[PDB]
């Protein structure tokens, strides 16, 4: 992959918060 | 009073001596300036040192221009302390860094005529190099019969 892709996709270790299950 | 030295890196292509002098003379007058360059090519190494006449003028310029996004480069503008200013940092400053065609001078080295004595010492060296290559090749099981260099 690309370092640019890593920088764009970088997030924190906290899991995502979802209102509901999505299709 | 004391001069201030700023190290600037991540220079985009085009941010060279005249551009840097003109841009940072807006902040304050510049005593010395040098872009670090390759001697074989003349090409910039994307870093330079600027010595401003006045220290907090240098500090203001560095804090203004640090992390500035310029032609895809996030600039690095830092103040170097006078203790770690090298005594020979601005050797070659405020002058052109010429682009010298070493390769073209090498081609003309091959091009121009030489005398009989010069061809003689070249022939002697060429025999020595062939002999050296010969006993190096003798380990690999290869034999090449080189024709004799006819002397001029």
């Amino acid at each position: 992959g690309l370092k640019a892709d890593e920088i764009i996709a970088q997030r924190s270790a906290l899991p995502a918060v979802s209102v509901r299950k999505r299709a | 009073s004391q001069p201030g030295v700023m190290y600037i890196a991540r220079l985009p292509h085009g941010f060279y001596e005249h551009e840097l002098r003109g841009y940072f003379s807006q902040f304050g007058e510049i005593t010395r300036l040098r872009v670090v360059r390759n001697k074989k090519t003349g090409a910039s190494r994307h870093r330079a040192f600027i010595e401003f006449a006045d220290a907090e003028v240098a500090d203001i310029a560095a804090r203004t221009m640090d992390k500035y996004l310029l032609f895809g480069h996030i600039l690095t503008c830092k103040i170097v302390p006078p203790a770690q200013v090298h005594p020979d940092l601005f050797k070659g400053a405020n002058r052109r860094f010429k682009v010298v065609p070493w390769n073209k001078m090498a081609g003309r080295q091959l091009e121009r005529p030489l005398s009989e004595s010069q061809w003689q010492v070249k022939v002697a060296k060429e025999e020595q190099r062939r002999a050296a290559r010969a006993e190096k090749l003798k380990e690999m099981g290869y034999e090449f019969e080189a024709p004799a260099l006819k002397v001029p």
Partner: protein, 267 residues
């Protein structure tokens, strides 16, 4: 030609034996994928400047014939025409070999960054380039593709032979079988790179080959190289060597005259 073919065959056999003996100390995979280099040493610089478009020498035993070789083809706009041509009216071996088709506009759009150029450099073995846009590829591909002569874009002719052309309505292309023949020829051809230097290196084969095929390729490369790309022809030719990437150089031709002509000898 002054080059003795028996001595060339002896050099090929000795070099192959030495490469095998060095690789023995997978063994077969190490012997394979080891290129054989022909080295030409001249008396003057072979060229005045760096020429970034390689010359092609056609071989009796073509290179890049392995099926694992990936080929990227860089064309003029549009890329859709050539992509459809590869997908529809190409032979299956070339369809499997061609791993990417991209036009110059998409190349300038998506591969301006140096890391993108390095990724594209790593993803393929051989790059072919249409002669309509090949003079723009040093700027689009940078020193990533042109500091080294190994993967420089090889010229191919895709233009139809006799305002601003609109790519969508007309592609201005020669017929597809002619494109296929040109691509196959350029993939197989040996490459000559002209630099202001006394040293030119040409890849003529691999270490897993046979010495007879290696010597035949060396002979035709020597003939075409001295005839086409060497100024003053055999008068400028000083030395000829055959070598592997980590081996020493075996001289196959060496000269008796160390000067260009009698004008170099002055008293």
């Amino acid at each position: 030609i002054p080059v003795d073919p028996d001595q060339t065959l002896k050099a090929c056999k000795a070099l192959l034996a030495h490469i095998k003996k060095a690789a023995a100390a997978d063994e077969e995979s190490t012997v394979a994928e080891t290129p054989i280099w022909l080295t030409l040493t001249t008396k003057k610089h072979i060229h005045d400047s760096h020429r970034l478009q390689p010359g092609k020498i056609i071989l009796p035993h073509p290179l890049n014939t392995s099926e694992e070789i990936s080929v990227c083809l860089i064309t003029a706009d549009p890329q859709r025409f050539y992509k459809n041509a590869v997908a529809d009216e190409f032979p299956e071996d070339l369809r499997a070999k061609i791993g990417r088709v991209i036009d110059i506009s998409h190349l300038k759009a998506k591969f301006k960054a140096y890391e993108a150029q390095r990724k594209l450099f790593s993803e393929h073995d051989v790059f072919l380039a249409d002669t309509r846009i090949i003079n723009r590829l040093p700027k689009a591909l940078g020193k990533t593709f042109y500091k080294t002569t190994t993967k420089r874009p090889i010229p191919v002719v895709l233009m139809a032979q006799r305002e601003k052309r609109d790519p969508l309505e007309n592609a201005n292309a020669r017929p597809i079988p002619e494109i296929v023949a040109e691509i196959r020829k350029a993939i197989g051809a040996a490459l000559v790179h002209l630099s202001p230097s006394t040293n030119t290196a040409i890849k003529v084969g691999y270490a897993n080959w046979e010495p007879e095929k290696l010597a035949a390729n060396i002979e035709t490369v020597i003939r075409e190289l001295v005839e086409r790309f060497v100024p003053q022809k055999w008068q400028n030719v000083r030395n000829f060597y055959v070598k592997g990437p980590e081996t020493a150089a075996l001289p196959i031709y060496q000269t008796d005259e160390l000067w260009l002509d009698e004008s170099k000898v002055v008293p």
